[PDB]
């Protein structure tokens, strides 16, 4: 059920010409594989040995255990971006190499710019009153601190009637309370992997971090 080489070229190429819309998923394709696919498709022969095989993004991964992206990857040199539908077509036709996961990234909106966020921020969220339980959660730099707060609340099974707030160590460094929840993680100047401690208000109205 695989289309003509002509159709593949046109359908995938036209895919690349898709305008960025907030919340839409795009996918990374390793440059080498894409060039081989391109060679195959432009060859004009469906039975040619230039058949690219399963989509192989091995060169894009740091390690094949957590499947993190290598740092400092550049669009056009290391990878090509395809929209979700174009990606789905490509996958249906050629499949994924071995146990490789798809590299899905979201289109985000920053003040003045819309872009596919290839490197989202990872935060280490911990409850102040349950420090054994640390969750690594992935956010967007465009996301608000308040969004981090609710996500933490639901990940830590926190009830809705309770007040929570965030503490964090910047690289200055100092431990501060994130009192302005209406700002982006970018305005908050957060590094990926940064520890963020969520605290729940006690019944008496006091905070566990302020018992003195």
Task: Report the CATH number that the domain containing residue 8 is assigned in CATH.
Answer: 3.30.2230.10
For residue 56, count other CB atoms closer than 10 A to its CB.
Answer: 18
Residues 8 and 110 in one domain: yes
Experimental method: X-ray
Q: Which domain holds residue 124?
A: 120-212
Are 38 and 114 within one domain? Answer: yes
Stated in angstroms to one decimal place, the resolution of this structure is 2.3
Q: How many separate domains does the chain show?
A: 2
DSSP, residue by residue, the chain: -PPPHHHHHHHHHHHHTPPP-TT-EEEEEEHHHHHHHHHHHHH--TT-TT---SB--GGGBS-TTT-PBPTT--BTTTEEEEEHHHHHHHHHHH-BSTTPPP-EEEEEEETTEEEE-SS-EEEEEEETTEEEEEEEEEE-TTSBHHHHHHHHHHHTT--TTS-EEEEEE-TT--EEE---TTSBTTTTT--TT-EEEEEE--TTS--GGG--
Is there a single domain that holds both residue 1 and residue 48? yes
Residue where a domain terminates, one of 76, 102, 119: 119
Same domain, 7 and 18: yes
């Amino acid at each position: 059920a695989m289309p003509d080489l002509d159709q593949q070229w046109r359908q995938i190429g036209n895919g690349r010409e898709r305008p960025l819309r907030a919340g839409e998923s795009w996918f990374l394709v390793e440059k080498h594989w894409y060039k081989q696919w391109e060679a195959y498709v432009k060859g004009g022969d469906q039975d040619a040995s230039t058949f690219p095989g399963s989509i192989n993004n091995s060169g894009l991964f740091e390690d094949q255990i957590s499947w993190h992206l290598r740092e400092r990857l550049v669009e056009g040199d290391d990878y090509v971006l395809l929209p979700a539908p174009a990606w789905n077509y490509l996958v249906s036709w050629y499949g994924l190499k071995d146990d490789q996961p798809p590299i899905e990234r979201k289109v985000i909106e920053l003040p003045g710019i819309r872009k596919v966020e290839v490197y989202p921020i990872e935060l280490l969220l911990v409850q102040h009153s349950d420090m054994e339980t640390a969750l690594t959660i992935q956010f967007s730099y465009s996301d608000s601190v308040d969004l981090v707060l609710q996500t933490a609340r639901e990940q830590f099974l926190v009830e809705p009637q309770e007040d929570t707030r965030l503490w964090t160590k910047n690289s200055e460094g100092s431990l501060d309370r994130l009192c302005n929840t209406q700002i982006t993680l970018l305005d908050a100047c957060l590094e990926t992997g940064q520890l963020v401690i969520m605290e729940t208000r006690n019944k008496d109205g006091t905070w566990p971090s302020a018992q003195l």
